Design goal:
- This is part of a larger assembly, with three copies of chain A.
- Chain A has 91 residues and is mainly α.
- Chain A has four helices and no strands.
- The two termini of chain A are 43 Å apart.
- Chains in contact: A-B, B-C.
- The interface between B and C is small, with 5 and 5 residues.
- Chain B: Belongs to the transient receptor (TC 1.A.4) family. LTrpC subfamily. TRPM5 sub-subfamily.
- Chain B: Homotetramer.
């Protein structure tokens, strides 16, 4: 079971690590039992009033979309070229 | 008459322009391009001489041509001289140029699409007539039909708006020819130490018989021409004549009649026949690009340039610019097959500068070739 | 007199070709091409080629230089290729205007 599972376990660990880091993003920086100070501060701020999942300006967003399209075209061209130069296709 | 344009629409972009008359010296416009607008002297100039006809290229051939041109140009800093009007092959070529510019992670090498457009073809010219230096003129982008008036393409970075000459209705063509000739006599670098003569090259895409005089004038100015195999207009005539091997007056007249049934004028037909015969008389300045067969525009460009240079002379120093351009494109096979084939003697002093260029730019194949060649 | 026509005659060699659909499509497109050059005339042969996934035959015969193709002409055939799950013909029509 170890031999068969370890490789999938590593990928599952990375996938879970994403969610754990996302959770740690919004977690207050004060560990319990101190955390009550941060909770009171958050409640007071909510009553009175992210590095991940950011929103970009229109120009930069369009630039990144065009860059993604160019990279996709390059990737597809590379796949097609590797298909043409394959031994079976040449045969 | 200097101003800036702030295109408004799907994509907001800023573009420069300058109004100019057909009697001006092209040296002034080249100087303003190099200095006022900060454009570095190009390492390659590709001028489009078609695509304004009603019939347009198929999307597959259009995409193949734009991809080939952009891929060839992106190695160095190249200029693409087109009529800066949002229509036909020019619109999509400018779109591809801007797409490459946005996705270019290296801004040191820049592909610039210069627009030489007649002032009579501009839609909403009064909108840009303001051209306040402090506040750039606002211009709306509209995809007009064929008609006779077009809108300035937003994807073209710089524009050359030429006024129509009262003498003849060919001011824009004369300006294009003069500008190509003037650019062909410059140096690609800032200083004339490690700089080549700027390679000016023309591309023909479904030409009309009206542009035959301008094409022959360009050929007289000794600048190579590239002909698309499947363009459709005069380009088809030229590729068929190349496939024939020889040209006859009856043959060229028959092909011109078949390809352009609408134009039936005895004087015009005779003039076009003579122009085509004189164009084919050169030949070495003509080269056919078949995207269905080759699809490697850089290779064909290099072959045309080296063919023109070889026809010009046999001296090693003359071949130097073509060899340097081949170095800049990693075309070691083409260089070995054409430049370093028996005819041209090569001394170490001649090859020292090209060795420096190949060594600095990380071209191991050319380093091996030069070490093996003296 | 039969051989005088010729374009309506086509040879099927099962030892060589053994692809009857391809030969049928070739004969029909040959007859249509001999009949006329208009795009609307080629429409039925193009639709039949769509129905048989003969993208190679269509590209080699119908979409080869001679016949002009407008978007309005190709809209119905685009619909037919898109509904019937013919990705090759979708690619061909998108690439052809």
């Amino acid at each position: 079971t170890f031999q068969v599972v370890q490789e999938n376990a590593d990928i599952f660990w990375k996938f879970q690590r994403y969610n754990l880091i996302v959770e740690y993003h919004s977690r207050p920086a004060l560990a319990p039992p101190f955390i009550i100070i941060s909770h009171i501060t958050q409640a007071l701020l909510s009553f009175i009033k992210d590095l991940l999942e950011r929103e970009l300006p229109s120009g930069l967003d369009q630039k990144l979309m065009t860059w993604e399209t160019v990279q996709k075209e390059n990737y597809l061209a590379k796949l097609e070229h590797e298909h043409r130069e394959s031994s079976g296709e040449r045969l | 008459r200097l101003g800036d344009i702030d295109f408004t629409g799907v994509s907001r972009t800023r573009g420069k322009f300058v109004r100019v008359t057909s009697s001006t010296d092209p040296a002034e416009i080249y100087q303003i391009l190099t200095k006022q607008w900060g454009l570095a002297p190009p390492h390659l100039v590709v001028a489009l001489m078609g695509g304004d006809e009603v019939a347009q290229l198929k999307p597959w051939l259009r995409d193949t041509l734009r991809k080939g041109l952009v891929k060839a140009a992106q190695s160095t800093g190249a200029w693409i001289l087109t009529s800066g009007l949002r229509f036909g092959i020019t619109k999509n070529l400018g779109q591809a140029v801007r797409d490459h510019s946005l996705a270019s992670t290296s801004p040191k090498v820049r592909v610039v699409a210069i627009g030489i457009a007649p002032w009579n073809m501009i839609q909403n010219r009064d909108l840009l007539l303001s051209a306040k230096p402090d506040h750039p003129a606002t211009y709306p982008t509209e995809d007009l039909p064929y008609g006779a008036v077009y809108s300035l393409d937003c994807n073209h970075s710089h524009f050359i708006l030429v006024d129509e000459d009262p003498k003849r209705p060919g001011a824009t063509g004369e300006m294009r020819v003069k500008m190509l000739k003037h650019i062909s006599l410059q140096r690609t670098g800032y200083g004339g130490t490690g700089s080549i003569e700027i390679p000016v090259l023309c591309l023909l895409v479904h030409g009309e018989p009206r542009i035959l005089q301008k094409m022959y004038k360009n050929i007289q100015n000794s600048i190579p021409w590239l002909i698309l195999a499947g363009s459709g207009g005069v380009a088809d005539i030229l590729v068929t004549l190349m496939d024939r091997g020889c040209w006859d007056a009856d043959i060229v007249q028959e092909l011109l009649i078949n390809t352009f049934p609408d134009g039936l004028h005895s004087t015009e037909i005779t003039s076009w026949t003579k122009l085509i015969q004189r164009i084919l008389d050169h030949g070495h300045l003509l080269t056919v690009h078949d995207p269905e067969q080759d699809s490697e525009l850089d290779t064909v460009i290099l072959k045309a340039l080296v063919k023109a240079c070889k026809s010009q002379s046999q001296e090693a120093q003359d071949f130097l610019d073509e060899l340097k351009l081949a170095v800049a494109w990693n075309r070691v096979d083409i260089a070995k097959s054409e430049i370093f084939s028996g005819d041209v003697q090569w001394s170490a002093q001649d090859l020292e500068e090209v060795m420096m260029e190949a060594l600095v730019n990380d071209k191991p194949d050319f380093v091996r070739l030069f070490v093996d060649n003296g």
